[PDB]
């Protein structure tokens, strides 16, 4: 039951291969949405049956898979082809300004992110979040969401499956190349909010 | 469309320990709210998930988690309780647990002080649980409606949220704890223990 | 030692918004207990310091923090409140503050809907505060008796623990939040804003 | 925490302890241990709030010190009683004296032992007779250090110079000889059981 | 000389085919494992300075790089000896008669153990390891997250690396295909030896 | 070993008045200080004849007495040199310009140093001393307990006795007043001579 | 006051400890202690009558360090005996070897630990088997420092480099191995009681 | 090759005769200093695993070992470069004109300094080092116990090792003889460089 990417599978080349995008979407993400759907269906049954032992395990399944589904979804909306105007950081004036108030420059921040991204041990994500008025950079393990009271602005997937087929162990290269497909329109929309 | 199951006894069945007014509110308002909100979130998810509506999905995962937790805790709680006259209020109904307890904390009475101390020391809203962790037993408390940690199995629980007692004991927590012992369903605790 | 401050009004001054019975229990029992348990925690922390009961000293540091915080919170709270008849109930008593509220939210009514959405979204026990953070205003929530974080000056708070309202409103915290605006002391709020 | 009243008037322990010593000892030495204990605890919760880990360590020290000072002087005042009270008669502590004569030879041999212990404290200190579960021991503590854990204090004797200097100058021995006259053996007996 | 180094493998990079491809083995060994060693040395270098220069800030930073790459190096070094060519006698459980008998006693049978292990392998969220450990007299299946090494007091018998880089090129997201095929290249002779010797013996 | 012949004070008992009373100066020297001297002497004599025999049990017992009383005598000896009448030249700090210079750089002001040491002095628990010591070219303020001497590597410049017999007869429990007034009779001449 | 002669010829302890080392350690190293103690006691009265405070600080140091040096080596030579003596046999210390095995599991396990702590010393010091109230303990001391009050020496081993260097050079290890042959277990047993 | 290693001497083991024998130089360099380097290298390795295994009790003991062996390593590394054959011009204080000027400015003479250093060297109880250091723009003589490095803020100019393994095979217990003779092989060119 899974919505199509806002773009083609090769729309993010050469930063991210058509191969990686299809596998990430039709296999990794799909799996989370499927097992989420499954867990959600059984749960309606376990309620009526008054199966409390089941409801506990299904609470685990729903939390875990719902997190994976949301992470990749936030992710696909964080990306656009490199040519698109949504790639140019002027699309996020108010945010970038707060970036430079906090880290000084755009680049002093891309650097700060890169460092945190490549410092993740295992699987996880890197997030630019909003906390109150200021910004932190945070990382999350596995499919954990950001701690409460932070608002995702944009995320970078640092699971190996997100780059391995193209960059092998070269995660530093992967990180240098994603900046070219980041969607600053979206980061702006989420920096302001509702 | 799940329907909140009725209690296994009358609202007045646990007096004098727990007033009928409390049973009625606790079940018909407080627990019913967990079910109704659970119900709405589950019926809404297919809509949000189809619209690729990420902010509603975050919100709905939260409502599923908090409200399902809520419903789990009170279902286990009602089953933990029986009228103080019923033989299931007699700790003789639980030979193996009452031994395993007596092995861990010296006697039954020493364990009741132990739990009572843990219950009374809860800061804000939460539950006290006697749990089965691995081989032996353990007293844990949980925050708000949080489940016990994975690997632990509930034997019995006590709601320490203020609505569980305020209408009848006001700020007199220790009295509430002292009187809840008479309506603990030891039959249920033995089943859960084996 | 610390002492229970008196109230700047009679136990029945906040009717009909908050009943005299809540006000008498909230003040002479709940807040009282925080004072008493802070004073006793201090005394008993010294004696545990004489011996080398480090677990005790660790646990008594927790108790000193918690009761002191509960002490500050309730002491601040009773001053955010005045009888509804009073001109301090009138936002006109807070000219600078309501102005800055208006340029932060939309209007005072948008601010009230926002703070009420915060207040009702607290899971378990907690407080909702309007604070100063540098030059602007923010709504924050805290769990249990936690104080507002550093750098934030509290303008006014609302207790969302069930003992704040339950005897009069039961689980109807919506009606409690709607009514407490009739007794918010905008003169205290305005004096704290500066 | 507060300043306990003495069981007697400031001049009730004469001629062993001058009323000047007793008045200063209780009204200003002990007082200051009390006050300083209050304030340190008051400020301690603020330091906890602030997560001001420096000030928590400073105050933890000031709390232990004034804390112990307040304990020691409070037991002290109740070890003492006017030399003419029947509480000053060793005969008013039968079980203790029995065991005391068991452990050392005489009640006099314990007095010379305990006095040897008091006169060899270096700097400021206390001497105590204590119950070590089954048996009695003479121990000494430096400054305001209270008796080690497990040891129940039966009676103590202050050897800070402020306890005797105005009346005995540097003659520590004259101070110890004379203080025996005002040991409250009824207290020492209650605390034994 | 105060630096660890990359152990040469006990076989060529293709010896474990078709179970694990010669590409994975070469990237896993000379790139992933190599980088754990290299960083471990780069951090041990400066730790001595910043310890005597009482630079407690970077004392802490370096301790972390050393915990991490130190554990990366241990775990992969144990792993390369757990494996052997599928055609070797060392890959036959009968190479570990004491250990396999203890396994059968502990679980139901050898196959009931494989079932439980693979269930633990697949249930890891993100990166991590599954191990057969001996804990006192008994055996256990445990998992560790990321590069965490087998906890003190336990002795590792064999581990299987579930980090994606260990299988992704050949198996993609197919974690269960990976696990089913690594049974064919478990070195049970290495397993027996560890079961029979001390912790320090490995 | 011979006989201890405790030198006299380099001024008369009433010299340091009105700061330190004549009653204290007399008893501090002839009773507290002399008691260290005589006790050290008798311990050294006994130590002699515990070496003459191989009485190693009491060689060990007498070391502590040799250390405590030797220390109490040195400390008080030094103490008398740090002192000189309020009216003297050497009570003025300019008698020690190489020192009063180093003190300013370190705390800011000769008065900001009186406070730092007033604070250290009044904060000693029980019996002890306060010293302005020399860590090569740096000046620390340290406290020692009982008759302990300063740590290896520290070199004394001037000490102030905070034992109660140093003030009690005159100042009772008024530690602060004793300290405030004891600045007036510090021998800054002695201060610098040890500095250099 | 003289250097007391050794309980044995300078070559009695060979081949564990050379006659060379024994003579140097006793006739020069230990002699220096005695000569410094003789000089300091003899020349204290002069320095004190002159108010030579710097010199009195030195004589306190000289009496301290040399006094400790003299006590330590005095106890050292008594802990030793020829490898051929019945006293070099732990069986001469049955009570102590009982208490050693009860605390380390074996003689070889205590030797293992004793030598670990000796070879562990940084710079100059001593290793001791002491008697800590009821039980047994390996401690080390720095330079000539005595063991802490309340500990009772049983046997010591000198770990200063002068104790072994002419024979063993940097071979810290070899010294400890071979010194086990010349421990006076007879002396060790008598100090254990 | 690894992380730390024994450095080669800048001269032959017998170069410092007659004041330090070739047997001492070889032992001191290839056994004593070597042991510092190796124990430090193996200490870093046992530390690396012991944090992985979360063995906190051995973490802190190996932090100790690392600090101790690191300090022994630096100390002897500085030592070897303080020395040179007595026939070299480098052994002539005229090699250190800026330092010798500041030397006399402080102590009076080169000789008056050598007696101060000598009395500090001989006054060490047990094992340790004596250094000329640069603290600020001034110099002073400090001693350290065992392998302690000089206090930060101090800059070593030269050090003289007073561990018995540095002199005993040649001078036995005659430290004074060893101190007098080591002045002939002090490398004052190194001293001058370190001072600038
Ligand atoms: Mn992904
Ligand atoms: Mn409830
Ligand atoms: Mn409240
Ligand atoms: Mn007192
Ligand atoms: Mn791997
Ligand atoms: Mn004095
Ligand atoms: Mn020796
Ligand atoms: Mn050396």
Ligand located closest to C76 CA? 3
Q: How many residues does chain D have?
A: 193
The bound ligand whose nearest atom lies closest to the alpha carbon of D71 is 4
Distance E33 CA to ligand 8 centre (A): 40
Chains sharing 3 or more CB pairs under 8 A with chain D: C, F
**Cα–Cα distance for residue pair D23/D18, rounded to 1 Å:** 9
Instruction: Classify the C-alpha dihedral H137-H142-H146-H151 as positive or negative.
Output: negative
Which positions in chain C have a beta carbon within 8 angstroms of at least one beta carbon in chain D?
Answer: 1, 38, 42-43, 45-47, 49-52, 61, 64-65, 68-69, 147
Nearest to G122 among H32, H68, H173 (CB): H68
Q: Where is B70: in which H helix or E strand?
A: helix B54-80
H45, H51, H55: residue with CB nearest E2:
H45
Q: Which residue of A has its CA nearest to C149?
A: A132
The nearest CA of chain F is from the CA of D124 a distance in Å of: 5
Query: In chain E, what's the furthest Cα-to-Cα distance?
Result: 57
| Separate counts of helices (H) and strands (E) for chain A | 8, 3
Q: Measure the CA angle with vertex H75, ends H69 and H76; round to 5°.
A: 95
Q: What is the phi-psi region of residue G156: left when phi exceeds 0, alpha when psi lies from -120 to 50, beta otherwise?
A: beta
Number of inter-chain CB pairs under 8 A, A vs E: 51
Q: Which positions of C make up the binding site for Mn(2+)?
A: 26, 74, 159, 163
Pairwise CB contact (< 8 Å): F173 & D162 = yes
| Cβ-Cβ contacts under 8 Å for F131 (sequence gap 6 or more) | F141, F142, F143, F144, F150, F154, F156, F157, F158, F159, F160
CB B77 within 8 A of CB A78: no
User: Helix, strand, coil % (nearest 5) of chain A?
Assistant: 60, 15, 30
Q: Given H32, H68, H125, which is nearest G143 (Cβ)?
A: H125
Residue H6 contacts residue H37 (beta carbons within 8 Å): yes
DSSP per-residue string spanning G12-43: TTTTTS-HHHHHIIIIIIIHHHHHHHHHHHHH
Distance, CA of A99 to CA of A75 (rounded, Å): 20
3-state secondary structure of D112: helix
Q: State whether residue G100 is helix, strand or coil.
A: helix
To 5 degrees, how large is the angle CA G103–CA G105–CA G107? 95
Domains of chain E: 22-82 (1.10.287.990), 89-196 (3.55.40.20)
C46 and D60 within 8 Å at the Cβ level: the answer is no
Residue C30: its chain B contacts at CB < 8 A? 171
Chain-centre distance of CA C65, in angstroms? Answer: 16
Q: Which residues of H are annotated as a binding site?
A: 28, 76, 161, 165
Are F168 and D170 in contact (CB < 8 Å)? no
List B136's β-bridge partners, or say none.
B133
Shortest CA distance from D50: residue in chain C:
C150
Query: Residue F84 half-sphere exposure, CB side, CA atoms within 13 Å?
Result: 17
User: How far, in Å, from the CA of D76 to the mean position of ligand 4?
Assistant: 8
Q: What angle do CA B167, B173, B179 make, to 5 degrees?
A: 85
Of H44, H49, H55, the CB nearest to E2: H44
Which DSSP state fits B146?
P
Determination technique used? X-ray
**Considering only CA atoms, which of F170, F171, F175 is closest in space to residue F23?**
F170
The answer to whether chain E touches chain B by having 3 or more C-beta pairs less than 8 angstroms apart is no
Q: Which residues pair with E60 in a beta bridge?
A: none
CA distance D137 to H11: 68
CA dist., res. H159 & res. H141, Å (int):
10
Q: From the CB of residue B86, how many other CB atoms can be counted at a distance below 10 Å?
A: 15
Closest CA to G170 of E40, B109, E78, H169: H169
Instruction: Name beta bridge partners: F142.
Output: F131
- Shortest distance between the Cα of E92 and any Cα of chain H, in A, equals 31
Nearest of F148, F151, F149, F128 to residue F140 by alpha carbon: F151
**Which letter does DSSP use for residue C12 in this model?**
T
Query: Which ligand has the nearest atom to the CA of G161?
Result: 7
Rounded Cα distance, B125 and C161, in Å = 9
Q: What strands lie across the sheet with B136-143, from one edge to the other?
A: B136-143, B126-133, B152-159
Region for residue F136 given its phi and psi (left: phi exceeds 0; alpha: psi -120 to 50; beta: otherwise): left
Verify whether the Cβ–Cβ distance F6 to G48 is below 8 Å.
Answer: yes
Q: Tell me the nearest-neighbour CA distance from B68 into chain A, angstroms.
A: 8
Q: Please state, in angstroms and rounded to a whole number, the distance separating the CA atoms of residues B142 and B154.
A: 12
CB atoms B55 and A3 under 8 Å: no
The DSSP secondary structure of chain H, one letter per residue, reads --S--PPPPSS-GGGGTTTS-HHHHHHIIIIIIHHHHHHHHHHHHHHHHHHHTT-HHHHHHHHHHHHHHHHHHHHHHHHHHHB--TTSGGGSGGG-HHHHHHHHHHHSSHHHHHHHHHHHHHH--SSEEEEEEEETTEEEEEEEETTPPPPTTEEEEEEEE-SGGGTHHHHTT-HHHHHHHHGGGB-HHHHHHHH-
The C-alpha atoms of residue A113 and residue A48 are separated, in whole angstroms, by: 47
CA of F24 relative to ligand 2 center, distance in Å: 74
All residues at 6 or more sequence positions from E154 whose CB lies less than 8 Å from its CB, including other chains: E133, E134, E135, E140, E142
Asked if residue G162 lies in contact with residue G24, where contact means CB atoms within 8 angstroms, the answer is yes
Q: Does C contact D via 3+ CB–CB distances below 8 Å?
A: yes
Give the CA angle between residues D62, D65, D71 to the nearest 5°. Answer: 130
Give the Cα separation of F114 and F122 in Å (integer).
12
Count CA atoms within 13 Å of residue H161 on its CB side.
27
The answer to whether B74 is a known ligand-binding residue is yes
Residue from the list B66, B125, B145 with its beta carbon closest to the beta carbon of C125: B125
Place of tokens 């680049």: A107
Q: What DSSP designation does B170 have?
A: T
Q: Using alpha carbons only, how large is chain F's radius of gyration in Å?
A: 18
Interface test with E, best of A32, A64, A122, A139 (most E CBs within 10 A): A122
Ligand 4 center to residue F165 CA distance, Å? 14
Nearest-by-CA chain D residue for C1:
D42
Q: How far is G59 from chain F (nearest CA, A)?
A: 9
Whether the CB-CB separation of H144 and H131 falls below 8 Å is answered with: yes
In chain G, whose CA is at the least distance from the CA of F46?
G41
* E strands present in chain B: 126-133, 136-143, 152-159
Residue written as token pair 């000892």: D25
Distance CA C66, CA C74 (A): 12
Helices E110-123 and E175-182 meet at what angle, rounded to 10?
A: 150
Contact A63 B65 (CB under 8 A): yes
d(CA D138, CA D113): 8
| CB-CB neighbors (< 8 A) of H138 in chain F | 137
Among chain D residues, CA nearest to C53: D149
Any residues with CB less than 8 A from the CB of E193 and at least 6 apart, and which? E201
Task: Indicate yes or no: CB of B61 within 8 angstroms of CB of A63.
Answer: yes
Feature table: binding site of E for Mn(2+):
28, 76, 161, 165
Chain F's closest residue to H143, CA to CA, is F153
The closest CB to that of E66, out of H2, H51, H54, belongs to H51
Q: How far is the CA of A68 from the centre of ligand 1 (A)?
A: 8
| C-alpha dist (Å) from residue D160 to A126, B140, D7 | 64, 50, 21
Q: At what angle do helices H110-123 and H175-182 cross, to 10 degrees?
A: 140
Interface of B with C (CB under 8 A): 25, 29-30, 33, 66, 123-126, 143-145, 161-163, 166-167, 170-171
């Amino acid at each position: 039951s899974l919505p199509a990417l806002p773009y083609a599978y090769d729309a993010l080349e050469p930063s991210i291969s058509a191969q990686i995008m299809e596998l990430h979407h039709s296999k990794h993400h799909q799996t989370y949405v499927t097992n989420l759907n499954n867990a959600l269906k059984t749960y309606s049954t376990a309620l009526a049956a008054n199966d409390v032992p089941s409801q506990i395990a299904l609470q685990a399944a729903i939390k875990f898979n719902g997190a994976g589904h949301i992470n990749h979804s936030l992710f696909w909306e964080n990306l656009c082809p490199a040519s698109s105007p949504d790639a140019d950081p002027a699309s996020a004036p108010e945010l970038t300004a707060e970036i430079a108030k906090t880290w000084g420059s755009l680049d002093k921040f891309k650097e700060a992110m890169g460092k945190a991204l490549l410092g993740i041990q295992g699987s996880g994500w890197g997030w630019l979040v909003k906390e109150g008025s200021g910004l932190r950079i945070v990382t999350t393990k596995d499919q954990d969401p950001v701690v409460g009271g932070e608002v995702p602005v944009f995320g970078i997937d640092m699971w190996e499956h997100a780059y391995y087929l193209q960059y092998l162990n070269g995660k530093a290269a992967y990180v240098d190349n994603i900046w070219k497909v980041i969607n600053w329109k979206t980061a702006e929309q989420r920096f302001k909010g509702d």
